[PDB]
Write a protein that binds this ligand. Structure first.
Ligand SMILES: NC(=O)C1=CN([C@@H]2O[C@H](COP(=O)(O)OP(=O)(O)OC[C@H]3O[C@@H](n4cnc5c(N)ncnc54)[C@H](OP(=O)(O)O)[C@@H]3O)[C@@H](O)[C@H]2O)C=CC1
Ligand SMILES: CCCCCCCCCCCCCC(=O)SCCNC(=O)CCNC(=O)[C@@H](O)C(C)(C)COP(=O)(O)O
Ligand code: SF4
Ligand code: SF4
Ligand code: SF4
Ligand code: SF4
Lengths: 112, 94, 145, 112, 340, 44, 176, 118, 48, 96, 208, 364
């Protein structure tokens, strides 16, 4: 059990595997509500399922951190929480819908 | 360095304050800074070099410490060739 | 062009020609484009400027001490790609980047030639022709210039 | 067009009246705190003049942005962020009167 | 000969066309005159007889080169000739309310101005502006005003086309008129001859006087004319002093004093080697009521409307207030009774 | 021959770049002993 | 790649505890700092006796601008105005006219020493070496106008400092 | 009807009394290059410039003396001028008219185009 | 010159008591140093 | 320095270091102010052949940005770059 | 070989292009165009409505963890109807990559504040409002930074003259620092430096 | 807003040193704009010059010569030593130490002498320019730098002796200004502000710019995110900069100091005075400047005070269309309010010291 994560404000998680499992399952639950053909859902599910499979397969925190390549496992849980919040806000925003409006005629022309 | 009628020292540029001009007050208890050495007179004083070639090169002296190298045609007998930068004059002998 | 010179020999020099009181001539800068000759022949109508000699010694200018006099003589200063032919009145007065250009019309004649009045620090420095295909193609008279 | 704060001119007029109320009540406090030598009536007249300068605006968004700028200026004055110099700059005391009749402009200078 | 075309929009960098030599510019009126000249863009030549430190406050008043400081001596005419040589305008503001060992009232108000006017006429200066108190008269009790009248006569003699401006007490931040009354608080009660009921004064704002001088320089008609500068309202000395103390929020304790006792007190303060707090001449001039001279043109002729004392009193007298009354507004004190 | 400002052949000598705060002073027991001995002699 | 400042744990043995207790009660570390200050007291001071002693400067120093001349005495300036063009602060005002000899010389050359940033440009830019920032640094003035230099003032500075300016240019001309 | 004049902060005198010229800058006749004739330019009216008494430097009081703006098209510059409430004058672009060039004409048998010298 | 003293104090100048008609016994200034000795004094050159 | 031996000992003991070995003030160790003239080398492009500027023109080799996607006309998830590798504690001094 | 010219790294180019396509696919609603510069920099062009959504997506790990707002700024191009181009520069420390998201606005059209997403945009958006005229809606405190307390115009706007419209001096008459119309003693000398000849043929715009 | 001496609200008012640098750059050529960057952060001039040079070179698609790059890295590390000396000593002086300031400012004077010898300006030299460095090192400078570096470690050690373990100094800084790593990242903090909190990010290693890939140094990382930890980080960074300086001294390459392209870097004076092409290019470069291919770039470096960035947009002309400077101090001063919560006035002074704010950068 690591004494400190090393980054101020981030505390060592006593039960990392359980927390990661719960967070990934919740992220998948939120993704389910999102339309099937939305790219966000497909990519996020792909990433989540890989992460959850890795978490379940490996019982050692250090080996899991090496496999995930997301930094210390506490940082991984923090990223999972961030993803969950994004997924929840995504549902409201509905980014998968077509472009709101095309830009003016020469709004991105440079040199002028 | 000639002196103007007002008593001011005319500059090499020829600048001197007319009696009408009010700007002469700036030197009332101070002085007008004029360089006594005049470039035109000193350049005139230099002797004219006589070279036996139709075209000669002037670098201003000192090589890289002078001015860009230029080649001067000396064919005209009437007038000496003058360096655009240095101001030195050259002429073919005879 | 390249950024360096491989020329390791002496450069040529040309004796300057006097063609009048308006055009200052430094012929060593000439690149023998022949623009001045063709202009004098075709537009001005004065066949007094030409090339004398052959090879690298070829030189542009009246063989004799003739003076190029015409209403449109000053335009050779504009036409010349290099500073071989330059305005004597405007010599050494200013550099191109300093000048502020104002587009205006000439009043010396009723032709209405379009001109660019070049001013620096509130002082008129030169008059340059402005292109109006209908009135003045690219030329202005000596009086306007 | 997307409204800045008001969808129609009447709402912007309401906001403008609220801002005018705020300035009108603030004027005496400004004279007291900044130790200005102007009278309260003089400052309130200056406030009216500043409001009247932009009385020609007919677009709701421009009026809303003007109200925002006025609120920022009022915040500056309510605090002491603006000094007596800034407060008295509205009164162009140092600047000399500039004649507006044609003959006076003709006499004074080349300005149109 | 020394004529310059005006150029610019009237700013700091513009050329007004006015080249001036402001004698006595290191003083209450000189500061404002120089500031007004500099803001237009005029060239101001300042003759200074004091240390250069005292002239430092005038240095920022003009753009680069506009303000030229040249040391001058009133007794020496050659310094006057040097200062006024290249000026198209000369303004004489040299006056000391207290006589000094080296220079008495005669020298400061008669000899100096006469020398200035004569040297200006010799030099060719187009215009000259001279300042003499409105109450100036050859029969006045005060030596100051008597010398002022004699100097006015001499200046008109030397310079026939000279504008002479006769100003009343000029109230301002650096004034010795309002500050003089306010400073009397330190001595307890305010000594007044006859309690001030018999004296009437018409103070003038300093900015109005300076603007009048500048407009007189600008005005072509001003040549060879005597203007009287007076404030909008005339006040009894008692009412004016009471208003001064009210705006200063300092207790007012007027006590009548006999004229001879006040003169003796003035003699006591004259003893000071440094600048005297008060002089017998100061007492006489304060007691003397301001003359009314309808014949002479005034500020209205020059285009400036006189600012009332009420508007500008707080500027001068706020500093004299204590901490309790420092922040009080101008409107709290009602205007004093006006004898008009 | 080219002459630029170049490192001396073989390079410069090593430059120390680490903290060298020294270890100084007596042990705490000794300092307390000295203080107490001074106190006792003063008391006597 | 990364190092841990702090991140050290004190020993809990009785000797180390007693040492730290002595440090707290007997103020050892403050005494160490006092000793360092005393050692500095006994070290030689670094103050130089200005004005009598002057700080080191190199030949590439950038100080007061100066207008140089050729050995003949002709002014090096050929009114290129490229040195005006490269001035980052637009501190150089140049006007030129053909002189009586017919040469391209400057009727007006002004450097505002109050708008100048002493960048060192126009010494690199000027083609003929005419304008040079010389060694002088002690040219403080009591008035703003004194610092608005004129062609006469610049030429006088060049004449005054030519002996040093030439030697410094000789020293650094190969590096340029 | 867009008006940003109140929001710009420009003083009224420059807003009302200034005429802005919308034009394609003409080619400098000294040079044959045409790259500097490809974009519209907005330039304000010239105003007084006077000599500084101390040094003779040209002094100005016109805040917009050096202000020049580049616009891809004439309409955009006009829109900017209208939004900022400046009176505008638009000079139509001048394009070199197509010319017929023949080197053979220099040696014509019967025409006057024959060149005396090459 | 005292080369033993550390750099910055090895070279020093004792200003003259009279220069260009000014009494400089007490009032001395850096500008009094002539240009030729300026480079030696300021260490731009090692040769006097 | 010129310090006497007693002062040198006192300062060294107070500091806890040998101050004489490393002295802040600068002595004859500094480089001579006058130096032999340099001969700066030329760069790669100083050649008399095969040096055409077209080959070595960097600016003209710049190109307008490539447009990956434009609105106006399974796949593996991707990242902006491969994830950063964790840093390794320094061997010389892992803990200060 | 080719010492003068900058070396090119295609690997980073391909990675950035792939991630740009990734972003375009995930948020087609807002992204309008994504381009990768040949110096290996990625730009995603977004509709003004998508600032908060796209930035929140970028910060949160949908394989992107741009959790640092390098800088926020605007570029005023008067020609375009939306004269202001809001530019966001983000840094992802997890993937050691940086991407740029750009949007447009007008003088009268507000853009949503990003203080919620990043919290470093408070002062950046205040600076954008102060210099340029953009108003950011829902900002915690929008006020002037870097300009004088009474400053009226919005500098950096390509209409504002470099010297401004007002100048400050101390006036003895009012015993106060007083503003006045600008009157330069030496007018800034405008230099026309652009050459008449084209320098880069690659960027030659179509004749039209 | 202080209840007693406790700061309820800290509101930073800036712009007292706003000189309109970015607006002025638009009116200047790229070379003319270079001196501006020296002034932005007075303490760390050469690093800002390097950042601008890197941005302009990336837009230009030109590569600085290797010796120029090594000179840039060396003088950048010297500038880092100067900047950290100033920051630490001025922080101590504000918290009352007042002796290390003089002690270290003597060494700052020596490093200024190195600056003067290279450029002729003690500070604000234009040495680092797009395309390389203006002039080659004067002969003998490297050995003098070695002489300085061999002894600088003792000075840093004496400063540590004065401050590192002092009870008073630790009390003034041990737990003041704590910033969480996530808060530090979100608030835009860079450099020691991030690394003090424990985040491992140094652009010199993560994204090397000039030759830092070829040098070995250790990034100092903190554990408590406090003022004391950041001070320790800055001291260790000074020591690591000394390590990098030794490495740069030993492996300085021979050759040119500016790109051998006369359309970007000016030709040598002799060549300009002897060759027509060189004269033409010198004339154009010093009058028009070099046109930069149209584009935009954000180039950042690990400056002594954090990440320094320039968002440079080019319209293809000789003058930049827009130049936006990302100053590390801007975000740190923005976060000052969050850091100050729960502290007293002296703690606020210490926190201002910790973030090493030079207001030329902040106001620009
Ligand atoms: N209420 C008023 O102010 C009135 C004004 N006036 C006249 O107008 C002027 C107003 O000046 P005021 O506001 O009173 O301020 P001051 O009393 O300071 O005016 C005197 C000025 O002249 C200088 N001066 C004084 N005595 C001499 C001397 N003997 N020789 C040379 N210079 C001298 C002073 O400089 P320094 O200190 O160095 O001597 C100062 O600049 C005076 O001449 C006054 O008589 C007339 C009527 C009323
Ligand atoms: C100390 C004195 C300083 C006072 C300074 C006060 C200020 O800054 S005023 C700023 C406020 N400006 C505005 O609100 C602009 C309002 N613009 C408008 O168009 C409106 O007033 C309308 C639409 C004309 C309506 O106004 P009316 O009711 O017609 O009239
Ligand atoms: S136009 Fe000029 S370059 Fe061409 S031939 Fe005539 S003089 Fe020579
Ligand atoms: S600038 Fe052009 S015309 Fe003048 S000398 Fe050089 S190449 Fe010839
Ligand atoms: S080098 Fe100096 S003197 Fe010569 S042309 Fe250039 S600016 Fe003028
Ligand atoms: S050194 Fe002086 S004159 Fe030369 S560019 Fe810099 S500021 Fe201008």
């Amino acid at each position: 059990l690591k004494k400190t994560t090393g980054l101020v404000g981030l505390a060592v998680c006593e039960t990392p595997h359980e927390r990661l499992k719960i967070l990934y399952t919740k992220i998948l639950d939120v993704l389910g509500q999102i339309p099937k053909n939305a790219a966000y859902r497909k990519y996020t599910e792909q990433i989540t399922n890989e992460k959850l499979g890795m978490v379940k397969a490996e019982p050692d925190v250090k080996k899991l951190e090496e496999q995930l390549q997301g930094g210390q496992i506490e940082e991984v849980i923090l990223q999972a929480e961030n993803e969950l919040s994004l997924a929840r806000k995504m549902l409201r925003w509905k980014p998968w819908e077509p472009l709101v409006e095309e830009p003016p005629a020469n709004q991105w022309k440079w040199p002028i | 360095v000639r002196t103007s009628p007002t008593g001011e020292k005319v500059t090499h540029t020829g600048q001197a304050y007319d009696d009408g001009d009010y700007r002469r007050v700036r030197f009332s208890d101070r002085q007008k800074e004029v360089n006594e050495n005049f470039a035109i007179d000193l350049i005139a004083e230099q002797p004219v070099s006589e070279v036996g070639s139709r075209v000669i090169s002037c670098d201003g002296g000192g090589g890289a410490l002078g001015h860009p190298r230029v080649y001067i045609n000396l064919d005209k007998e009437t007038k000496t060739g003058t360096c655009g930068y240095c101001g030195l004059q050259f002429r073919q002998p005879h | 062009g390249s950024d360096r010179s491989r020329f390791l020999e002496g450069k040529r020099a040309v004796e300057d020609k006097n063609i009048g009181p308006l055009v200052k001539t430094i012929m060593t800068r000439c690149i023998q484009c022949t623009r001045c000759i063709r202009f004098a022949s075709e537009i001005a109508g004065v066949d007094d400027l030409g090339t004398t000699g052959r090879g690298n010694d070829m030189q542009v200018g009246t063989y004799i001490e003739k003076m190029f006099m015409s209403e449109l003589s000053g335009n050779i200063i504009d036409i010349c790609p290099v500073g071989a032919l330059t305005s004597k009145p405007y010599a050494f007065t200013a550099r191109p980047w300093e000048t502020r250009k104002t587009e205006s019309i000439d009043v010396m004649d009723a032709v209405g030639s379009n001109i660019v009045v070049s001013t620096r620090t509130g002082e008129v420095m030169r008059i340059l022709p402005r292109m109006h295909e209908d009135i003045n193609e690219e030329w202005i008279s000596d009086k306007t210039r | 067009v997307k409204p800045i704060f008001s969808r129609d001119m009447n709402e912007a007029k309401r906001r403008v009246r609220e801002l005018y109320r705020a300035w009108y009540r603030e004027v005496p406090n400004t004279v007291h705190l900044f130790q200005l030598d102007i009278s309260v009536k003089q400052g309130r007249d200056k406030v009216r003049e500043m409001f009247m300068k932009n009385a020609h605006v007919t677009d709701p968004r421009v009026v809303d942005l003007l109200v925002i700028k006025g609120k920022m200026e009022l915040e500056e004055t309510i605090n002491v962020w603006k000094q007596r110099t800034h407060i008295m700059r509205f009164f162009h005391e140092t600047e000399a009167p500039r004649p507006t009749d044609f003959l006076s402009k003709f006499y004074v200078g080349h300005d149109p | 000969h020394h004529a310059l075309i005006p150029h610019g929009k009237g700013g700091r960098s513009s050329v007004s066309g006015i080249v001036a030599t402001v004698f006595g510019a290191t003083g209450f009126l000189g500061r404002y005159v120089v500031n007004h000249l500099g803001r237009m863009g005029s060239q101001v030549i300042v003759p200074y007889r004091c240390e250069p430190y005292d002239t430092m406050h005038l240095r920022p008043m003009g753009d680069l080169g506009q303000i030229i400081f040249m040391e001058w001596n009133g007794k020496d005419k050659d310094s006057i000739r040097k200062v006024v040589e290249h000026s198209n305008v000369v303004i004489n503001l040299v006056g000391r309310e207290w006589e000094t060992k080296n220079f008495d009232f005669e020298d400061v108000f008669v000899k100096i101005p006469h020398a200035i006017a004569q040297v200006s006429k010799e030099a060719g200066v187009e215009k000259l502006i001279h300042i003499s108190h409105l109450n100036a008269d050859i029969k006045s009790p005060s030596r100051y005003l008597r010398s002022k009248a004699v100097g006015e006569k001499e200046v008109r003699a030397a310079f026939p086309e000279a504008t002479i401006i006769k100003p009343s007490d000029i109230f301002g931040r650096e004034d010795r008129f309002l500050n003089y009354f306010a400073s009397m608080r330190w001595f307890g009660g305010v000594p007044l001859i006859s309690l001030g009921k018999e004296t009437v004064k018409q103070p003038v704002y300093i900015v109005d006087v300076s603007k009048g001088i500048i407009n007189a320089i600008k005005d072509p008609d001003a040549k060879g004319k005597t203007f009287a500068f007076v404030g909008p309202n005339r006040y009894l000395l008692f009412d004016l002093v009471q208003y001064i103390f009210a705006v200063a929020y300092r207790p007012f304790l007027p006590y009548p004093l006999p004229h001879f006792a006040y003169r003796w007190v003035g003699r006591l303060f004259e003893v000071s080697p440094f600048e005297p707090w008060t002089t017998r001449d100061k007492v006489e001039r304060v007691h003397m009521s301001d003359m009314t001279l309808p014949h002479l043109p005034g500020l209205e002729d020059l285009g400036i409307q006189a600012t009332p004392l009420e508007l500008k009193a707080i500027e001068v007298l706020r500093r004299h207030r204590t901490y309790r009354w420092l922040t009080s507004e101008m409107e709290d004190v009602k205007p004093a009774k006006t004898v008009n | 021959k080219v002459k630029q400002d170049m490192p001396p052949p073989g390079g410069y000598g090593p430059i120390d770049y680490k903290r060298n705060l020294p270890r100084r002073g007596l042990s705490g027991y000794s300092m307390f002993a000295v203080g107490i001995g001074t106190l006792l002699f003063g008391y006597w | 790649t990364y190092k841990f400042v702090n991140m050290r744990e004190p020993s809990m043995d009785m000797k180390s505890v007693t040492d730290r207790a002595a440090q707290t009660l007997l103020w050892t570390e403050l005494v160490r700092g006092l000793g360092m200050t005393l050692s500095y007291l006994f070290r030689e001071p670094a103050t130089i006796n200005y004005p009598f002693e002057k700080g080191p400067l190199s030949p590439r120093f950038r100080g007061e601008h100066a207008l140089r001349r050729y050995p003949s005495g002709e002014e090096r300036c050929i009114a290129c105005k490229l040195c005006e063009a490269v001035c980052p602060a637009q501190a150089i005002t140049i006007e030129a006219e053909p002189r009586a000899d017919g040469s391209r010389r400057t009727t007006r050359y002004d450097i505002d020493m109050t708008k100048c940033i002493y960048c060192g440009f126009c010494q690199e830019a000027c083609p003929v070496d005419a304008i040079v920032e010389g060694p002088n640094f002690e040219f403080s003035t009591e008035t703003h106008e004194e610092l608005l230099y004129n062609k006469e003032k610049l030429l006088n500075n060049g004449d005054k400092w030519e002996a040093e300016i030439a030697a410094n240019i000789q020293a650094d001309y190969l590096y340029r | 009807k867009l008006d940003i004049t109140t929001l710009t902060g420009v003083p009224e005198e420059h807003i009302k009394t200034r005429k802005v010229r919308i034009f394609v800058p003409a080619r400098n006749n000294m040079q044959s290059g045409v790259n500097n004739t490809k974009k519209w330019k907005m330039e304000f009216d010239t105003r007084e410039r006077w000599e500084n008494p101390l040094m003779g430097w040209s002094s100005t009081a016109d805040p917009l003396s050096n202000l020049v703006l580049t616009f891809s098209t004439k309409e955009d510059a006009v829109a900017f001028a209208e939004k900022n409430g400046w009176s505008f004058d638009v000079e139509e672009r001048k394009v070199p008219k197509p010319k017929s060039k023949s080197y053979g004409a220099n040696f014509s048998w019967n025409k006057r185009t024959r060149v005396s010298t090459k | 010159e005292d080369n033993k003293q550390f750099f910055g104090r090895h070279r020093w100048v004792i200003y003259t008591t009279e220069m260009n008609g000014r009494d400089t016994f007490w009032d001395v200034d850096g500008s009094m140093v002539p240009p030729e000795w300026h480079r030696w004094l300021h260490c731009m050159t090692d040769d006097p | 320095a010129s310090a006497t031996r007693v002062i040198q000992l006192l300062r060294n003991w107070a500091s806890g270091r040998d101050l004489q070995a490393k002295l802040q003030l600068r002595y004859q160790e500094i480089s001579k102010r006058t130096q032999p003239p340099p001969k700066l080398p030329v760069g790669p492009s100083h050649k008399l052949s095969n040096n055409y500027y077209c080959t070595r023109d960097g600016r003209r080799e710049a190109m307008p940005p490539s447009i990956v996607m434009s609105s106006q006309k399974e796949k593996k998830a991707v990242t902006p770059a491969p994830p950063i590798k964790r840093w390794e504690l320094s061997k010389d001094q892992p803990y200060l | 070989t080719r010492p003068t010219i900058r070396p090119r790294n295609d690997v980073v180019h391909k990675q950035l292009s792939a991630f740009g396509q990734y972003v375009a696919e995930i948020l087609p609603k807002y992204v309008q165009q994504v381009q990768v510069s040949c110096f290996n920099e990625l730009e995603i062009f977004i509709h003004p409505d998508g600032v908060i959504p796209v930035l929140t997506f970028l910060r949160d790990h949908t394989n992107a963890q741009f959790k640092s707002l390098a800088d926020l700024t605007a570029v005023d191009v008067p020609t375009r109807q939306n004269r202001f181009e809001i530019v966001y520069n983000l840094l992802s420390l997890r993937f050691n990559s940086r991407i740029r998201v750009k949007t447009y606005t007008d003088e009268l059209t507000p853009i949503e504040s990003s203080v919620t997403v990043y919290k470093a945009a408070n002062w950046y958006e205040r600076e954008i409002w102060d210099m340029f005229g953009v108003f950011f809606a829902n900002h915690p405190d929008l006020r002037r930074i870097l300009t004088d307390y009474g400053f009226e115009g919005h500098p950096f706007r390509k209409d504002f003259p470099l010297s401004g419209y007002v100048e400050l001096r101390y006036d003895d008459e009012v015993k106060r620092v007083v503003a006045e119309p600008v009157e330069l003693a030496q007018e800034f000398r405008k230099f026309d430096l652009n050459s008449p000849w084209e320098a880069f043929p690659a960027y030659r715009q179509p004749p039209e | 807003e202080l209840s007693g001496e406790m700061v309820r609200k800290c509101d930073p008012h800036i712009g007292l040193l706003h000189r309109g640098t970015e607006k002025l750059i638009e009116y200047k050529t790229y070379l003319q704009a270079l001196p501006y960057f020296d002034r932005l952060d007075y303490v760390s001039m050469m690093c800002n010059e390097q950042a601008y040079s890197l941005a302009v070179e990336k837009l230009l698609n030109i590569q600085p010569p290797p010796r120029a790059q090594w000179i840039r890295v060396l003088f950048g590390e010297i500038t880092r030593l100067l900047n950290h000396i100033m920051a630490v000593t001025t922080h101590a002086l504000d918290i009352g130490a007042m002796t290390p300031f003089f002690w270290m400012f003597e060494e700052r004077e020596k490093m200024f002498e190195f600056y003067e010898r290279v450029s002729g300006a003690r500070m604000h030299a234009a040495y680092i320019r797009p395309g390389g460095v203006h002039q080659d090192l004067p002969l003998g400078l490297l050995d003098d730098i070695y002489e300085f570096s061999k002894n600088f470690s003792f000075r840093i050690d004496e400063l540590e002796e004065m401050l590192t373990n002092n009870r008073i100094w630790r009390n003034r800084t041990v737990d003041i200004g704590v910033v969480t790593a996530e808060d530090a990242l979100n608030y835009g903090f860079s450099g020691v502000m991030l690394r003090g909190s424990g985040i491992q990010w140094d652009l010199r290693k993560t994204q090397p710019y000039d030759v830092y890939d070829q040098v070995e140094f250790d990034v100092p990382i903190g554990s408590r995110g406090d003022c004391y930890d950041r001070y320790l980080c800055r001291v260790e960074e000074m020591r690591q900069s000394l390590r990098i300086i030794s490495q740069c001294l030993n492996k300085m390459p021979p050759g040119e100091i500016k790109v051998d392209d006369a359309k970007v870097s000016p030709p040598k004076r002799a060549e300009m005075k002897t060759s027509m092409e060189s004269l033409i290019h010198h004339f154009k470069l010093y009058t028009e400047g070099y046109q930069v291919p149209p584009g935009a770039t954000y180039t950042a470096i690990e400056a002594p005070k954090g990440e320094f960035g320039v968002y440079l947009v080019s319209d293809g002309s000789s003058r930049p269309y827009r130049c936006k400077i990302k100053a590390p101090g801007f975000a740190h001063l923005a976060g000052l309010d969050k850091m100050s919560k729960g502290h007293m006035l002296a703690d606020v002074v210490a926190i201002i010291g910790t973030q090493d704010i030079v207001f030329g950068e902040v106001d620009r």
